Design an enzyme around this catalytic site. Structure first.
Site, PDB file in Angstrom:
ATOM      1  N   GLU A  32       0.460  -1.123  -0.031  1.00 29.27           N
ATOM      2  CA  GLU A  32       0.250   0.013   0.078  1.00 29.27           C
ATOM      3  C   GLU A  32       1.384   1.084  -0.192  1.00 29.27           C
ATOM      4  OE1 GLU A  32      -3.741  -1.129  -0.047  1.00 29.27           O
ATOM      5  OE2 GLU A  32      -3.014   0.950  -1.689  1.00 29.27           O
ATOM      6  N   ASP A  33       1.458   1.003  -0.963  1.00 30.01           N
ATOM      7  CA  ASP A  33       2.311   2.463  -0.832  1.00 30.01           C
ATOM      8  C   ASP A  33       3.806   3.134  -0.564  1.00 30.01           C
ATOM      9  OD1 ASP A  33       3.095   5.227  -3.405  1.00 30.01           O
ATOM     10  OD2 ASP A  33       2.803   5.675  -1.527  1.00 30.01           O
ATOM     11  N   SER A  34       4.298   1.970   0.768  1.00 25.59           N
ATOM     12  CA  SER A  34       5.030   1.790   1.983  1.00 25.59           C
ATOM     13  C   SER A  34       6.374   1.356   1.251  1.00 25.59           C
ATOM     14  CB  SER A  34       4.498   1.364   2.885  1.00 25.59           C
ATOM     15  OG  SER A  34       3.699   1.806   3.512  1.00 25.59           O
ATOM     16  N   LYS A  49       5.546   7.990  -4.709  1.00 32.97           N
ATOM     17  CA  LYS A  49       6.007   8.722  -3.852  1.00 32.97           C
ATOM     18  C   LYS A  49       5.800   7.542  -3.057  1.00 32.97           C
ATOM     19  CE  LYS A  49       1.913  11.212  -3.211  1.00 32.97           C
ATOM     20  NZ  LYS A  49       1.213  10.624  -3.894  1.00 32.97           N
ATOM     21  N   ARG A  74      -0.409   1.980 -12.053  1.00 35.76           N
ATOM     22  CA  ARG A  74       0.537   3.914 -13.169  1.00 35.76           C
ATOM     23  C   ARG A  74       0.980   3.583 -13.569  1.00 35.76           C
ATOM     24  NH1 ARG A  74       2.303   4.056  -6.286  1.00 35.76           N
ATOM     25  NH2 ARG A  74       0.660   3.090  -4.921  1.00 35.76           N
TER      26      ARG A  74
END
Ligand code: MG
Ligand code: ZN
Ligand code: ZN
Lengths: 302, 224, 357, 48, 80, 43, 242
Positions: free
Chosen positions: A54-56, A187, A220
């Site tokens: 989850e984007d960590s 990010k 993405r």
């Protein structure tokens, strides 16, 4: 990054000077006109314990200790006077009124905390009393993280009246909750920091600085980040820096054949071992230098 | 005295003159620690006592002037590069002092030194180069132009329509057995039947149209 | 002979290259090798589990006591250091990571840099003057490190630069060895150049099934004296062994006191004559946990369960052992496994003495 | 593109993939589509 | 602000060869530069500047991280 | 300044002071991933 | 969290579905009840087990996301590029050493005995025996012509907690999957027991990938030269029809 080349001469507020910056292994024409801001972190695109979901991201603790994305963060304290009423000086408990409870007035020297001392929460950094016998109009350091007094001066304002200017500095390493990003806009938040013996390593000893989830790619379509790793992997071994500006002619098939010419695999993947157990994965892992940048969103401030 | 000292100690001109005074040893290399050291440093840098400064009306006339007066006429390009850096530094300070004092014949000297420092900055830019590489095409001898971009090409109209004019509908998958002994040699199935009739013993050879019953790879045999 | 066929080679400067030769001569007047060189050591282990070899590697990486240079509080002289760009954080980070080969914790250094010129002056590690301790008969670091740089007319004074001891898992400045190779020599490999194998690791057995017992491990040590290389590397190896033994011995002290109520060990009597043991050692890593799990499993092939979970946010190793024996038999088997570990690493130390002459 | 151009590329047909890279007109048309995703996201907070 | 003392990734002592690698690198570029202004070097489109053998002559291993951080690190002295 | 301008908007009396509230004994921080925590646990 | 260097609020990734959250820079509030009345009400009403099932859509909110969805598929997959998807006793025991449940019994296993992923999953789902039979997300008619599906992977069947066949993926274990494994456990044993199984199965899936490995590279996105020629023949037919 190097936010200004004349930073020591400035008293700026909420400004961060990152010590080490690198030119990207795959640079662009934009770097002929501005200084690059970031580092060529080695990134492994793998699942490692579920801490990068989850984007960590998972960061190497050794990379943090060595100064990766580390810098100094600055704050400002400008205090003004009332002409002929207020003054700078250390108050006295037996005369002055409504002193702040639980405040440390003992660090002041002639009304200002001397340069080089560590100020923590509840310390009085600037002493200021108004003459009624006196009322304590002092300034107390209300921040959780301790600072160090970096510069103290008494300049003259537009009205030729004294005001106190103080610069406070913070030694900011990378720490859990700080935001990093790639030049493709992906990010992430630093979630876990592992010791150098817990990070995964390749057969030749290469280990990542960041571990990013492979699941951040497919939805993405940040393919320029994966091509940069493929190109930069052969740039490091060949000892070169190439140009990856947009709309320049590229052929990912030929860039992949460039990897095999330098002794690597076609896909740029390598046999890796789990650092905690020493066991190899049953899959070659895509690992290589991807330029990452630290975004100025500090968890210590939020 | 205090207001004058506070005003001047925050002047960038003061720190620049103090640096020039430290370089040639006129003042101690450390900041003043005592009132006497501060007064001495002020007297040396500004050239006037703080009490005597009020007394008059000049300020820039007697600011430090470096001791070593090198020859800046070798800045005419003519153990040289470090000497060149020294000359650039000293000439820059001397012209800064001249500008403060409005010394006559300054603009021409300023442009001259601007050209000199542009050359010096070109040298420093040479020093500040990480390197650069271009992936060359072996067939040529210059930067690679090969790309996997789309390239338009008018295909034959037979790739869309048959000899009776109807469009193609590639909806029959043709599978050939990988092993020669496997039977039957070919199986033609539809998308909903692939899971029911095809195993790993067969491989997808070609598609087939459900109208004219031609293989996709044999579409060029149609008379255009 | 568990450990045989070591090979040691230093990393040296090639002076046959004209650019390197000219730069080294013009910068440092350098004509030969530096006093301290990196040393690559490749080791072959046979008849030993992957847990022991990888634990040795991990300990040599960042779990062995090691020395660095640090600045005592107040050592950075603010009154004397006039340089605006060489901050204490920057210079301290630089100095902490200079690899040293120290002899004692009594050496104290100082850095007194004065810039009396009109050009920026670089401060190198050759400007670190020793000010306390016995006079050095051999340098403890190389003189070619760029500590900093001073603008014209600036200064940098740092006193009380001392030798600090620690382990690399706390701060990375105490890291010792960098990984350069790890392979299993008793597992066959594919040619991974071929496009049909390039997505796989290369080994012909799965890691879920393979049990390699013949390994090659290659580690590089960053700073070792030129004339004593064999003496240094050997020491390091032996040191690592002792470290591991020590930690294992600590757990041996737990099992010996299982009758007394002790917080690091919990014993349960479950159903079906099964006994459960939970050992919680704080501030322990995957090294000892993996060693314990592997050797208990080797000692008890038909064990009901053994696991060693180490949670990052709890900062402790929890080893769970479920076995169908009584508490006394389980503890006996536990000391047997610990004794096997101790014997293995003692044999490793003896082989280290026997190989590196 | 010219006036009254008839080719499909002139009206937003992107013939290339991301792995091959887009040309300048293709990137502009892709940026037109991608700007809506940012506008509709900012509107999906206030309008909701 | 300088080439790091050790590699940011693995900790190999890159710094002990940094200064030398600086000077040598410049000399090497002076051989390959060619009728082009210095600030235009990253735009030449005909350059083949490879430092592989130069770094190898320093004894630095063939590690991706070490050579990356040695090659790419910016120097504050050269921009100020 | 008027009495009835205190009421209307989002920053007014009704929406800011009555329908919402500044409170004590509360904390805020950036959130992070942790795969060792249960679904009903917070680090 | 006893580490003084940690300043973040940490939570399991499967808890993000409650708050529409992720870890790209989101900030969340946290207040701890101090009064007895509010501290009783937090336990009995506002516990997150009370919203495992969505009040909006009447379906489960939580499940596997992104590492335990592909990790469950890899674990329960029938075959591997290395042959059969089996693991020895030591590695089978290692999947349960983080689940924080009561470990199963491996005493009836030699060190050289091989266990597959369906046996290991069954050892966990036996505590909450449910019945499930659906086709996984892995099987699609879209890929069927061009892929050789394994007949043991395209039919997930669980009876009384034993995974008879099939792979576990978004259909069975994914977040928001109505009629999935955790939706069925909640309806039979309660939403708190379903939350335990989401965690326990997430540790099995992640511990399998702990030495199976999962990566994405640039070559994963690259068509072969023969296939690139086929794609632009397809596009040229579109532009021909245009
Ligand atoms: Mg967000
Ligand atoms: Zn047809
Ligand atoms: Zn390195």
């Amino acid at each position: 990054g190097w936010y200004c080349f004349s930073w020591p001469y400035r008293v700026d507020m909420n400004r961060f000077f990152q010590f080490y910056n690198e030119m990207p292994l795959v640079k662009t024409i934009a770097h002929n006109y501005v200084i690059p801001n970031g580092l060529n972190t080695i990134v492994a695109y793998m699942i490692y314990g579920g801490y990068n979901q989850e984007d960590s991201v998972i960061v190497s603790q050794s990379f943090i200790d060595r100064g990766g994305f580390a810098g100094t963060f600055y704050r400002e304290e400008k205090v003004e006077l009332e002409s002929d009423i207020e003054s700078f000086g250390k108050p006295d408990p037996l005369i002055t009124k409504n002193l702040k409870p639980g405040a440390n007035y003992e660090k002041l020297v002639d009304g200002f905390v001397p340069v080089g001392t560590v100020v923590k929460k509840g310390d009085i950094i600037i002493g200021k009393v108004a003459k009624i016998k006196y009322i304590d109009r002092s300034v107390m350091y209300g921040f959780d993280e301790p600072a160090v007094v970096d510069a103290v001066m008494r300049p003259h304002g537009p009205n030729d009246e004294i005001f106190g200017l103080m610069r406070l500095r913070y030694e900011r390493n990378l720490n859990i909750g700080d935001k990093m990003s790639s030049r493709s806009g992906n990010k992430g938040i630093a979630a876990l920091a592992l010791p150098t013996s817990d990070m995964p390593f390749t057969e030749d000893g290469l280990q990542p600085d960041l571990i990013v989830n492979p699941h951040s790619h497919p939805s993405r379509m940040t393919n320029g980040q994966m091509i940069e790793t493929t190109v930069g992997l052969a740039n490091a071994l060949q000892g070169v820096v190439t140009d990856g500006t947009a709309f320049l002619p590229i052929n990912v098939q030929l860039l992949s054949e460039r990897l095999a010419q330098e002794g690597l695999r076609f896909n740029g993947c390598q046999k890796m071992f789990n650092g905690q157990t020493g066991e190899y994965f049953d899959a070659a892992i895509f690992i290589g230098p991807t330029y990452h940048q630290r975004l100025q969103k500090f968890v210590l401030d939020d | 005295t205090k207001v004058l000292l506070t005003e001047i100690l925050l002047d960038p001109m003061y720190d620049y003159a103090a640096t020039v005074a430290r370089i040639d040893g006129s003042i101690p290399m450390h900041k003043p620690r005592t009132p006497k050291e501060a007064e001495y440093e002020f007297k040396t840098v500004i050239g006037r006592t703080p009490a005597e400064l009020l007394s008059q009306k000049e300020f820039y006339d007697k600011i430090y002037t470096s001791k070593y007066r090198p020859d800046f006429t070798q800045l005419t390009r003519l153990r040289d590069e470090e000497k060149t850096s020294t000359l650039i530094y000293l000439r820059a300070y001397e012209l800064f002092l001249k500008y403060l004092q409005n010394a006559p014949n300054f603009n021409s000297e300023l442009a001259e030194f601007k050209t000199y420092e542009n050359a010096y900055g070109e040298q420093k830019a040479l020093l500040a180069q990480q390197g650069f590489y271009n992936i060359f095409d072996p067939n040529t001898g210059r930067a690679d132009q090969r790309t996997r971009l789309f390239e338009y090409k008018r295909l034959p109209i037979s790739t869309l329509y048959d000899e009776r004019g109807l469009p193609h509908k590639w909806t029959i998958y043709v599978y050939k057995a990988v092993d020669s002994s496997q039977k039957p040699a070919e199986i033609e199935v539809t998308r909903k039947d692939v899971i029911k009739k095809i195993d790993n013993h067969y491989a997808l050879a070609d598609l087939r149209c459900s109208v004219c019953h031609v293989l996709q790879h044999e579409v060029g045999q149609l008379n255009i | 002979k568990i450990f045989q066929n070591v090979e040691i080679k230093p990393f040296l400067i090639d002076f046959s290259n004209l650019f390197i030769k000219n730069a080294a001569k013009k910068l440092f007047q350098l004509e030969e090798q530096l006093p301290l060189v990196p040393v690559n050591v490749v080791m072959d282990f046979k008849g030993i589990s992957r847990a022991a070899v990888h634990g040795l590697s991990r300990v040599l990486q960042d779990e062995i006591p090691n020395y660095m240079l640090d600045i005592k509080p107040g050592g950075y002289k603010i009154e004397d250091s006039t340089d605006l760009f060489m901050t204490e954080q920057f210079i301290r980070n630089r100095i902490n990571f200079i690899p040293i080969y120290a002899k004692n914790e009594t050496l104290v250094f100082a850095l007194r840099s004065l810039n009396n010129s009109c050009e920026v002056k670089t401060i190198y590690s050759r400007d670190l003057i020793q000010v306390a301790g016995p006079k050095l008969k051999y340098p403890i670091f190389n003189p070619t490190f760029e500590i900093g740089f001073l603008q014209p007319g600036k200064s940098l004074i740092i006193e009380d630069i001392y030798i600090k001891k620690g382990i690399g898992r706390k701060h990375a400045a105490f890291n010792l060895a960098v990984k350069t190779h790890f392979s299993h020599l008793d597992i066959e490999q594919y040619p991974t150049d071929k496009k049909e194998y390039m997505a796989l690791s290369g080994y012909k057995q799965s890691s879920m099934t393979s049990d390699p017992r013949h390994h090659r491990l290659g580690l590089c040590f960053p700073a070792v004296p030129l004339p004593h290389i064999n003496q240094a590397v050997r020491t390091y190896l032996k040191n690592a062994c002792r470290i591991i033994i020590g930690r294992i011995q600590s757990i041996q002290k737990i099992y010996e006191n299982f009758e007394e109520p002790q917080p690091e060990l919990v014993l349960f009597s479950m159903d079906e004559e099964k006994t459960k043991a939970i050992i919680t050692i704080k501030d322990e890593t995957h090294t000892i946990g993996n060693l314990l799990k592997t050797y208990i499993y080797e000692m008890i092939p038909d064990i009901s369960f053994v696991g060693y979970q180490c949670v990052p946010h709890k900062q402790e190793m929890v080893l769970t052992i479920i076995h169908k024996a009584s508490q006394e038999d389980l503890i006996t088997l536990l000391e047997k496994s610990i004794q096997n570990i101790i014997q293995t690493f003692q044999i490793l130390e003896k082989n280290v003495d026997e190989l590196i002459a | 593109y010219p006036r009254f151009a008839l080719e499909a590329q002139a009206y937003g047909f992107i013939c290339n993939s991301y792995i091959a890279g887009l040309t300048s007109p293709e990137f502009i048309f892709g940026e037109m589509n991608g700007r809506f995703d940012l506008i509709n996201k900012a509107l999906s907070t206030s309008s909701t | 602000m300088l080439i790091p003392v050790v590699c940011f990734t693995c900790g190999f002592p890159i710094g002990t060869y940094a200064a030398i690698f600086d000077k040598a690198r410049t000399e090497y570029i002076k051989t390959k530069m060619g009728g082009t202004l210095p600030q235009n070097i990253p735009l030449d489109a005909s350059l083949q500047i490879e430092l592989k053998d130069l770094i190898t002559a320093l004894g630095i291993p063939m590690r991706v991280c070490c050579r990356t951080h040695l090659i790419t690190t910016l120097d504050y002295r050269k921009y100020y | 300044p008027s009495i009835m301008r205190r009421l209307p908007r989002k920053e007014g009396r009704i929406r800011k002071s009555l329908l919402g509230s500044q409170v004590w004994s509360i904390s805020r921080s950036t959130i992070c991933g942790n795969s060792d925590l249960h679904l009903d646990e917070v680090g | 969290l006893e580490n003084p260097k940690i300043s973040t609020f940490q939570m399991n990734v499967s808890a993000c579905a409650w708050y529409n959250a992720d870890f790209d820079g989101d900030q969340m509030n946290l207040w701890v009840p101090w009064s007895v009345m509010s501290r009783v009400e937090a336990e009995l009403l506002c516990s997150v087990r009370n919203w495992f099932i969505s009040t909006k859509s009447s379906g489960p909110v939580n499940g596997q996301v992104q590492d335990s969805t592909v990790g469950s598929f890899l674990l329960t997959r029938t075959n591997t590029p290395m042959g059969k998807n089996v693991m020895n006793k030591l590695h089978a025991m290692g999947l349960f050493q983080t689940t924080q449940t009561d470990p199963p019994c491996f005493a009836n296993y030699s060190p050289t005995d091989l266990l597959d992923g369906k046996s290991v999953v069954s050892m966990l789902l036996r505590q909450t025996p449910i019945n499930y039979q659906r086709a996984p997300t892995w099987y699609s008619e879209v890929y069927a012509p061009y892929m050789h599906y394994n007949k043991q992977d395209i039919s997930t069947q669980i009876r009384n907690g034993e995974l008879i066949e099939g792979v576990l993926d978004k259909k069975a274990v994914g977040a928001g999957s109505s009629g999935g494994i955790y939706h069925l456990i909640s309806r039979r044993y309660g939403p708190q027991q379903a939350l335990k199984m989401i965690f326990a199965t997430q540790q099995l899936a992640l511990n399998y990938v702990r030495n199976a490995g999962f990566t994405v590279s640039t070559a994963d996105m690259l068509l072969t030269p023969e296939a690139h020629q086929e794609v632009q023949e397809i596009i040229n037919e579109l532009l021909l029809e245009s």
